Structure formats: structure tokens, C-alpha cells
Amino acid sequence: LTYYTPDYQPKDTDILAAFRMTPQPGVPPEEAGAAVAARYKGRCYDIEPVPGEENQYIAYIAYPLDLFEEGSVTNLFTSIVGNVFGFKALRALRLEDLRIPPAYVKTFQGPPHGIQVERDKLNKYGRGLLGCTIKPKLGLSAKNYGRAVYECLRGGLDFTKDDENVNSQPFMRWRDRFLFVAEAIYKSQAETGEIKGHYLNATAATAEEMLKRAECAKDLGVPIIMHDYLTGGFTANTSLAHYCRDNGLLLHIHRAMHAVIDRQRNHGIHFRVLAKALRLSGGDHLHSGTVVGKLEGEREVTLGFVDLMRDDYIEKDRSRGIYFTQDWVSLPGTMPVASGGIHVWHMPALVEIFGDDACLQFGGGTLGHPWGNAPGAAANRVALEACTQARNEGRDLAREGGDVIRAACKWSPELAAACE
Amino acid sequence: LTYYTPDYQPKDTDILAAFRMTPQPGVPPEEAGAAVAARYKGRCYDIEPVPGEENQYIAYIAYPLDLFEEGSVTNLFTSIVGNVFGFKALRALRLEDLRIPPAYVKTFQGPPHGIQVERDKLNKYGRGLLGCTIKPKLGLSAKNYGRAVYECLRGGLDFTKDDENVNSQPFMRWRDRFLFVAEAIYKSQAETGEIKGHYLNATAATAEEMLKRAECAKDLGVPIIMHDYLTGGFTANTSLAHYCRDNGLLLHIHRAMHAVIDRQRNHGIHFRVLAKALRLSGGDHLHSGTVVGKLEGEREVTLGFVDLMRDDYIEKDRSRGIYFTQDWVSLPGTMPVASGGIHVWHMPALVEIFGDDACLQFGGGTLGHPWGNAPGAAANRVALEACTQARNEGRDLAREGGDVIRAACKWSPELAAACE
Amino acid sequence: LTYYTPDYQPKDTDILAAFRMTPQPGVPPEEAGAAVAARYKGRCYDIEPVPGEENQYIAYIAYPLDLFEEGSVTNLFTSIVGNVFGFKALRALRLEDLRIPPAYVKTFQGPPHGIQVERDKLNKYGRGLLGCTIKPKLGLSAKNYGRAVYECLRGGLDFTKDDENVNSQPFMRWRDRFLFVAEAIYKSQAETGEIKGHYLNATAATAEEMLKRAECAKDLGVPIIMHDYLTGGFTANTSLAHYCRDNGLLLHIHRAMHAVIDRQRNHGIHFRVLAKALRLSGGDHLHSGTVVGKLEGEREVTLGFVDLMRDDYIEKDRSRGIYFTQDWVSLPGTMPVASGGIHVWHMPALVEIFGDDACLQFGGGTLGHPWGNAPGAAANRVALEACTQARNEGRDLAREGGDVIRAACKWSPELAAACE
Amino acid sequence: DKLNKYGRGLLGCTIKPKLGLSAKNYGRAVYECLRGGLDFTKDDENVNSQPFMRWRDRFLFVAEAIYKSQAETGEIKGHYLNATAATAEEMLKRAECAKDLGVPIIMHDYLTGGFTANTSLAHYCRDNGLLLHIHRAMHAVIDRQRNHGIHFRVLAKA
Amino acid sequence: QVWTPLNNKFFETFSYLPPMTDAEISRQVDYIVSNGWTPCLEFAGAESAYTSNENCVRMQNTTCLYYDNRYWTMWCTDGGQVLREVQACRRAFPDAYIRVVGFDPVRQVQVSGFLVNRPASVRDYQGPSTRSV
């Protein structure tokens, strides 16, 4: 096998992939790794069997740096996973991890601002950010959408966001929504005195239309926009990220259509690779998990991709799914956004798991507070601040979250109607 | 269940989806269809069990036309398959078909030219088109790439194409390749007297760079460019298709990363939906199948999506995988491109299966002809023309393909060295 | 007759026309319908005689959807009524109605904002809008025009408008008028606290000049402009409507030169077809009737075209002149504007006939109030609000309009000088 | 005349530490130094645009600091914003951002950027009413040795 | 109950909790010191405490992410010293909001920022029970 070189030592500039592959019976693992690998040739330098699964191996592939176009996530995905999931010799194939060498990382702009620049621009420190998804999902007029945005933001929420499928429809054209949301953002800012924002959806049919929506957001002076990178495409995302860096706009990234590629354990691309591709292409926030009942998915896997998308240097840790040491050479980090049913008594768990550098999203639209949207937002903000204060005092949140919530509720009438 | 309405009659403007879903044990099929469905609410109007698979049902969902943005494949995919493959209540979920109502179809430009306008512009009638993928895949200099293009085109091939991963690399920058390929195209045109072309890869990191490459192709006067729509994104593709319509350029579409979504039978999106999304977004050609050994995949399924991407009116045919009647209301058709190991004696089978409105691609780079690239191209062209002539005479290609090939070889020295 | 097919069933995508034709004596109605009708051929599928008129028939023509250019009212009118009114075989011909299939409707942008978006932007609900035409018609300087605008708006009027023939003249150039009207609008807004506006006439000789005037209005921040679509042309109107949608401007449409085409009962195009063409091309308001003495014209006909230009779904009603069911598939509605001599005691009748979704225009320039322009505007506003309040209480306006007017006058000194 | 300061020398400070500071902290240091009574502050000579502090973030935070110090003291303040860049296009873009913020003055390294880049920046500054501070980086490589090179006076006249 | 929109201003972190006591401030400063960070004190009067768009009149192109009064005025070993400085700032400027800031000395970035003082004289803010009416 010219393409299986177990004695090869990967270079400091090689792009490395870790494939979890299940070959068809009768096909030796060495032959299957050689096929995936097949001066500019990709080569399989390491194969390890999976302890716990039958006929399952991890194949490590090394690609020369000259193979890829500088600063192009599109080309990287075309080269690595263009036509390899269609090999008949493989029963199942799953890309688990990528190693982006610093030499390649330096060719990317990365996220427009990052976590620290975001915190400095918004003047919010020492706590997680809070967001809500305006509900109902569709049918609402731009005026009523703006009213809901203002009501939720004035309560104490830092962000609101358009629904993932809200781009521009007969019921609510995009420019009307942008104008009414801008009025709501400014009203809530004047009322509370804190900087507010709303994830305006710029996702559109053509790059020209998407840039026009970003331009409108820039002309209104609003802080942040939103994009669907897995449906819009890396090419559209990279254009939007370059624009946002040029014009000082924050960029929230929603991972629509992700489960179509990262759900099945045997086939597809693991979300961590999609998260690294997003960080390379550019995004200040990246919807990274759902909290149905509780944070779903293995905690270690979540922590692994959160560290991969946040930290500057992540050492190899197979326990958390890190197959390679990832040096980001000072590329700005991406803030993970945990969305879903974030109930008030579940805030301590998520604050403990994520820390301060994350945005908790109430994608359920809240509305569970009997008093209204604004008091519900206040209750959430009070709960988050109380949990953060308790954690800063040395409390163990996983053991005293209920006590902290009760103690905060003892003095908060808004949280009292929420804790019931 | 408010979202399961078996008595509902879908409207003439509804977008219809046919989901193949396997619910978790204990979950009734009606409940699972209701969940997928959940004035602007999607509703499950029909559920049929799959005869042959245990706990497998086809769920038919009706979406109101007001839900989607006009002329936006990105929004359509965000709405239909945004977050539905991540439902825990479903063991597996697979989108099988879509029904695009004429009202929605009319909001899309569609392919820039289509099959008939392509034939008229290229002045080629009554036969399939021929193409080759310049090989080696990578490492070749722009000069040598152009030399290979000229050698393959002068033989009689109608098209050549850049490798899917060839965009712009240190070994071969894109503008050098465009210039040398333009010189090769013009030399081959002058030599043979037939209009020639080369699928120039415009796939790039940013929409601006992609439009710049398209602009260079337009300034050279070359006929056609190429795009990777599943990696570049629908937003980038739609921009390129609008540009190509505006400037009179043909657009070849390569489906990189397709098997990551359309390979597994239980999970993902069937290629036919991706083909319909491509036809809506825009593309004159669409790589539609591989011929490893022979045309791979169920013939009926291939014929179904070929008819779906070619014809103007496709009636429901569950045998070929057509779950809904598709009216295209005069949208230009897309030419299917069958690539892979198209050996000379396998030409009659593919000519019979596809007919004249297809491009046969020698993605293996040919080179199997002992004489050279040009005679190998001639042999292929001679074989294709002989098969077409035999089919026009009333011959049964599936039974007399070898006889036709031998008879053509009796007078063709180039085919004689190829038939051995 | 190849073009008369009484057994033909019109398709869901056909454009249908209902022609009222009087053929020359000796010409059978079937032959005349065949001539008007004459894969892409228009066909006469139905002919009904007119009960009450001699030798008068209604001919129903079906045109294939492929015949027309997407989003082009100009092409639609060229195809349907290009050269058919010049047929010698017809003594008289009158286009009565059109059926625009949803498939065609979806290709049009429609009005820039519509009624509901207009109400939300202006923050005015539950009542009709009020407007005045600045008088004298011509000769007034830009300064004096602005003074009149400010005086009329401060009284309580929601809108003022330029005279139909006021575009740009030696006596009053357009930019001076725009500036003075902007100052007047802002002064009246500051004084009353309500959002005000003035229909600035953008109608010009060249599309470039018209877009420049729209651009000036956009740069002043004023809310609304005006256009003469039947004299400027559908091509100019569609450009202005696209611009207004892009830049967030309202668009009032005046139907100058309409009686030259929609006055005679036997020849021409009925206003309802012109109203549907305007709604397709784009317009937020459309001058729809005159109130000389009282609302002129058959009430049912007026109600029919008001419903056709307002509602989303209008069922066939021959009593009101609706020859076909019109589905607008969520296209924004157009607000009808009734102008002319709207006297104070005639307000209850028009409020009952039109409801809240209409603008009552005092095209007489008011001035009948002995006190001044501002108190006259106040009297009108008081009368309209009193009539609306009475209607909301369950009163029958057509029977108690005088009582309501008197009761309002009992407490309104401004209305007391107006009611005399 | 533009700064309305007469009869005295002008005062400036170089924000320290030289590198590593975030745009927010750089702006905080600028505001603290300017509010004291200094007429100018300046970016470090090697501070152009780095992973630790991108140039547009620094421009925005410095603009906020300049305006805060102006409001507090009532005197016109300024900060030498470094426009020195890799390409003339990028340098003109940074000058354009400074012009759009309304800030008074920018900075350039003429002996490293080049006379061609400097002349373009000076023409732009004349066109748009911006002051231009010039730093002589790499000067000692040419004007230090008494026997060889070009005396600084010739570089000053250039 | 209805969140009051009248005189209900807030100052980001820990502003929605009841006013922190000396022990609570001390514990927060000890947390900042434990992480290896430097605590400092910011203060601003009511005229320059809330965000504003006063200087946006001087700008063109865009004003995205620009807000006035984000910077306060600067006023660091342990909680007791920072508490003493808090009392000193209170005495020197009784009508000024005081904010404790944290600075990571290695990354040279701000890592903390919570209000610790609300001037009794100013009434632009509500109390934990008066936030809803």
C-alpha cells in the first residue's frame, strides 16, 4: 500500500483528520485507511481499533498544506470530505476531528470580534449572556415582533433573536422588521441603561441580498446580526464575517440542518469539526447545544467542543473527543450559545457547566411567567446573577443550586412567580 | 393531535414533504408525524406504513406557501429540515421528496440557460456530450494543465473540467489556470472547428472572490464555469446562477459532500431533493451519478431523479421514487452528468439509459489509450457517435452494444487501440 | 373554430379575461370570441349573452402562463389589450375583469408596504385617514405651498398632497417645494405630536429624474411620495415601487387620464382591471373614487373594486362586477382613497361605505370653514372621529349620521362653524 | 488655529505597555492620560493591527476616550492613530475610518511605509482636514554613522 | 405585576441583586484576587453614568458598537483594601455610582465589572421590591 505509511511522522504543517470507519467484512482496516488516504497525496499514518465496537477503527490521515486554498473553509471541506462518504468499501464512515496547523490558521480572518472584544463592546463582564427567541415562531407582524422584542429586552435580557426560519416573508418583510426591532432596541436601551441587541437574521437567497441586509443593520447602528452557515454555505458565511469585521458588527451563527450531518454516530461529520470550520470561517456566537430537560449529549463531548471553540490551545484528550492538539495561534474565540428550555431552577447546572463565557438562550420564548414577558426576563436575569454570585463565593452549584435559587426568590417577587 | 389532520386536502400552493421516519418503540406513527409537522403550522395529512420494513412509515407534511421567502433555497431548507433530524422521538428520519408548487417555482430564476439553450449555444444536437477530468488531480502547473486540456479537447471531447479540489493553490493559482485553459480552448476550437469548453472552477472562500473568478471567465470569453453548491452553499450558488444568466455563461454544478447527506437509507436527504434544490437555485449541468463498473444505484431511482431534473412535468411514480407530481411550469431543465469509469464497451448501456440529453464524463482522466490523450478522446467520440447512430436506426443497444462497438472498431484505428 | 373551445377547462395557471363585446351585425358571437382569442394560443372557452343589452356577450379568454414576462404589468397589458380594440369585426369591446393566477402573482413585488404595514408605520388604528389637496392648484410659491401644508396638517389632517399637475414649474421648482414641505411636515409633527405626511409628486419626464426626486424625499426623511401611473407608465411605476420598498417610502398613486380608458360602458378597460394592475405593479394608496355630492358610480361596483384592491381573497360576484375569483396569495393590499367634495355631513355615509381602511381626501382644498384652514381640518377630524365612535357603538350610520354630527357639533366649536 | 492652543508647547504621551493591551484597556489608558491635561496621546510605533488588538476596535475605543476627555476638560484633545499598514489601500481605509469618527489626527511611519505611501496619506489628509504625525522608524539605520549614510536633516527636508 | 419603566436604571453585573453589603463586596473582591486578577474602582456621577449617543452626531458611515459613558473614571491587594477605597470614594464623591473592575494582568484584558454603590441622592433606580408595580 503506497498510501498506508505507519512509519510516517506528520509534519508541523499537515492537516490531520481522524476518521472513524467501519469497513465491509473481508476488507482489512489497512486497505480501507489506504483508500480514504488515496508529494500531494494524502496518507494514512496511523490506524487504531475502537475498543468496544466490532470492526471499528480510527484512521489518521495527513494532508500536505499545499493541497488547500488559503482562508477557504469551502475548499477544505471539498478536499477532506468531498467524495469519501460514498466509498462502497466502507459500511460507515465518520469524520471525528481535524488538526488545523497554525500555518493554515493564520490564513483565516476568524471571528469578527471574538469573546473578549464582544465583552468590551457590550461592557458586560463576569456573567453569562441571556437571550430569547421571539415567539410565536411565524405569523407575527413586524410591529408586533418589535413589541415582543422590546418587552423581553426591557426585563433584563441582553439579547433577543429572530426565529431561524424568519428571513423575509409576505407576513413580515425584512426591512420593516429591522426598523421596528431597531426602535425596540433603542427604547429598551434608554429605559434600562444597558446596551441591548437583537440577532437580526441576514440569511438570504443571494450573497447580494445578505450583504444588503447586513448593510441595513449597519445603517441602523444596531449591534448584531445572525446567519445560518450550514444552509447559507461557508462561502456566504465568510463574506458576512469579513463584512462584519470591516463594519464593526457582531455575528451570531445558527447551526440549521446540523443534525442531518452530525446526529448518527456511524456516519457523518462530528459537530466539533463543524464548530472548528465555523471558527475558521467566522462567527462571534455559535448555537452549540440544546437544554431540553437538561444539557443533552455527553457532558465531556460538549465540554470538549466548547473548549475547542473557546480556548487558544486545546491539548489532545480522547476522553472529551479531542483527537489532536489544536493550536489556534491567537485566533479570536467563539462564544457557545446553549438554547432550549432553560428553566429557572436549571440555571445553576448550566452556569456550572459553561461558566461566564457563554450565552444562555430561552428559545422557548419564556412566556411561562404569569405576569408577562418583562418580569419573566427579570426573573431569569435575577436567577443568573444570583447563581453567578454564589459561584464566585466558593459555593458548589451542583449541590446548592436549589438553595441559591430559593434564597434569591426570598427577595425577588418576579422570581417568586417564576419559581412556582 | 392538532398537527395530524388525515382529512386535510393539500392546497395547490402547499409545499409538500414526504418523510420516511422510524419512530422509537412505544411512539405511535401518528404522534411522530404530528411532531415533524409541528394558519402557518405544518400539518401531517397522510401517513402510510412501509411494506417491507418494520416500524417504518412515510409521513406527508403540508406547509403553507406564506412560510418561505421567494426564490430562496436557503430558506426552504432552513424551514423544512432546519431542526427536525435531531428529534429524540425518531430513531431515524429521511426526507424522500418535495412538492414545489408552481406558485413557488415561479419565484425562482432557475438554471441560467437550461438544456435546449445549451444545445443551441453549443450547436450540438442529437447526441450526448463528452467530458474529461484533467488528471493528475493536483500538483500540475497551469501550463501543463492547459496542455492536458488542449490535448484532450482536440481529440473530439466537448468539455474538460478542473478537479473538484482545484480552486487556487500555491502549485497552480487560479488566474494562471484560467489564462492557459483559455488558450488551450481556443487552440482546440481553431484546430477542430467545433465549439469547445472547460468547466473552470469558480468555487472560492468569499462570494466576492467567486464573482471575480466568474468575471475573469466572462472577460476571457470562455463558455462555462463550475461550482460546488453543497460545499459553497445555496446562497453562493444562487448568486453565481444569477450572474451566469446576466452574462451568458453556462454553469456546471458538482455535488461535493453529497454522500455525507444522501448515502444512508435511514437518515438524511435523498439526492432527488438536492437535485430539485439545485434546479431551483440554478445549474445547467449537475453531476448526477457514477459509472464505477456500471451505472451504480437502482436504475429506476436514477431514472426518477433524472426525469425530475430534466422534464417539465413528472407524474407521481413510487416505483421510481417520485412521491409527488412535480410541475416545473417551464423552468429550464438541468442536464445530468454521469461521471466515473466510462469504458468504451460500456458506452451503449449509458447511451440507452440516459439518451441524448446527458453528459458522459471520463473522470478517470482516460489515459488508458496507449497512443495518447487525443486518440483516446477520438476513440470515445467515435464510440459514442456509433452507439447513437445504431440507436437511431432502431437497434436495441442493450443487446447489440458489443456488435456496434466491434463494427465501429473495424474502421476506426483509434478505437481499435482502445477496444483492446 | 380552432380558437373557440367551449369544452375547455381553464388551468390553475391560466390568465383569464372577461371581455364585453358587441360584434357587428351578421357576425355570430362565437366568431367574434374566436377572433379575440386568436400551446401558446389564447382560446375562448365560454361565451354568455348579456341579459338586458342587444347583441352583447361576455367572452371568457384563457391565456397560458408562459405567454407573459414575470413581474411585468407592461407585458401583461401588451399581450391582453395590445391590438384587440382595433378589430373591425367588433362594434365595441370592453375588458371587464382579469384573473391573475397565484403563480403569476408571486412574480410581482406588489405594493411597497400595504395597508397593515402603513398603519403600523404611522401608528394610526381604528379610523380612516384624512388628506387635503393644497389649493390653489397652481401659481403658489414653494414657501406659500409649505405654509398651506403646515396650516392644514396642524389642524389634525394626517396627509396633504401636491396637485396632480404640480411636478416642477417656473413658478415652483420641485426641490424648493420638497424642502419647504419637509419643514412644514416637521413643524406640524412637533406641534401636534402625531406623525404627519405629504404626498410629494415624483412624477417626472425621465425615470432618472423621478428616482432623483424619490431620493430627495428619502434624504429629507419624509414619509410618502406620489406618482401618476397611467400617465408616467407601468414601467416607471414599477421602478418607483421597487425603490420605495428598498428605501422604506410609502407610495400614493393618482389615476390621471383614467376616464380616457374607463368611462364609456361599451369601450375601454374597466377601472377594476387598472386597480388590479396597480396592485400588481405597486402602490400603497390608489385614488379610487370621487364624492361629488355623494360617492359617484354604482355602490356595488365601487365595493367590488375596493374589495378587489383590499382583500386577499375575493370570490366571484357578478352583482358587484367580480367575473372571477381572485386569490392574491398574501400580496399587500392597496388602500383606496376617496377624494372630492367630502362635506362634513357626508362623512357618515363614506365611513359606512368604506370603513376604516380608506383615506378620505378633501380635494376641494376645504377653505369653506370661515375661521381658517387649521380649524376646518380640526372640524373634519372631529367629525370623522365622532362617526367612527358612533359606528363602533353599534349605531346605524346611514340612519343616524345627522344625529351623530349634531351631537359632535354640540361640544365642538370648530365643527359648529363648519356644520353651518 | 484648529486646536485653539497658543503660546505654549504641546504635550503628548505614548500609551504603555507597548504591546499586549486590549483595545478597551488602550482606550482607558488614553482617556486617563488625556483627562489629566495632555494635548495628545499616540499609538506605539509597532502597534498597527495585531491579534491582541485589531485596528478598528482600537480606533473606536480611542474615539470614545478622546470624546470623554474633551467633554470633561473642555479642551480639544487628540490621539495619534497609527495608519501604517501593509498596502496603500489598507492605510487609506484606516485614514478613512479616522475621518468618519471625526477624530483630529493620525500617524504614519514614513521611512518604513515609504515616501510614496506617505505622499498619498498627506494628500488625503489635506483633502479631508486631518492632521498627520510622522514617526521616523528605522532612521538610525541611515542617519547614525557619521561617515556613511544620509544625515537626518535631509530626511527631515524630504 | 408590571416591570416599572420609570426610574428603573441598571448597571450590568449584579445590578439586579439587592445592594451588596460590605461582606459581600469583600467576598467578590476576594474572588477576583483569588483568580490572580487586579481589582480597581470606577466611579461616575449621574450625568455620565448611563450609556448615551451624545457623540454620534460627529460620526458618519456607521455608529455600530459605539456608545458613550462606557468608560468611567478610575479611582489592590485584598478585599479589605478595596473596601477601604470604596469608603474613601464614597466620602469623596457621595453622588457618584462606584463600580469594582477586575483586570487579568497576563492577558491585559478586563475580566470583571460590578456596581457596588448607588448614590442615595440620585433616584434613577428602583429597589428589589419596587422594580414591579
Residue numbers in the entry:
A (entry chain A), B (entry chain H), C (entry chain B): 22 to 59, 79 to 460
D (entry chain F): 160 to 317
E (entry chain P): 2 to 76, 83 to 140
Which passages does the manuscript contain on this structure?
To determine where CsLinker binds CsRubisco, we elucidated the 3D structure of the α3–α4–CsRubisco complex using cryogenic electron microscopy (cryo-EM). We prepared samples of α3–α4 and CsRubisco such that the solution concentration of CsLinker repeats was comparable to the value we measured in the chloroplast (32 μM in this experiment, 37.4 μM in vivo). This concentration also saturated the α3–α4–CsRubisco complex. During processing, we observed a low-resolution density in addition to the core subunits at the equatorial region of CsRubisco in the RbcL. We hypothesized that this additional density corresponded to the helical regions of α3–α4 and that substoichiometric binding meant many binding sites were unoccupied, giving rise to poorly resolved density where the linker binds.
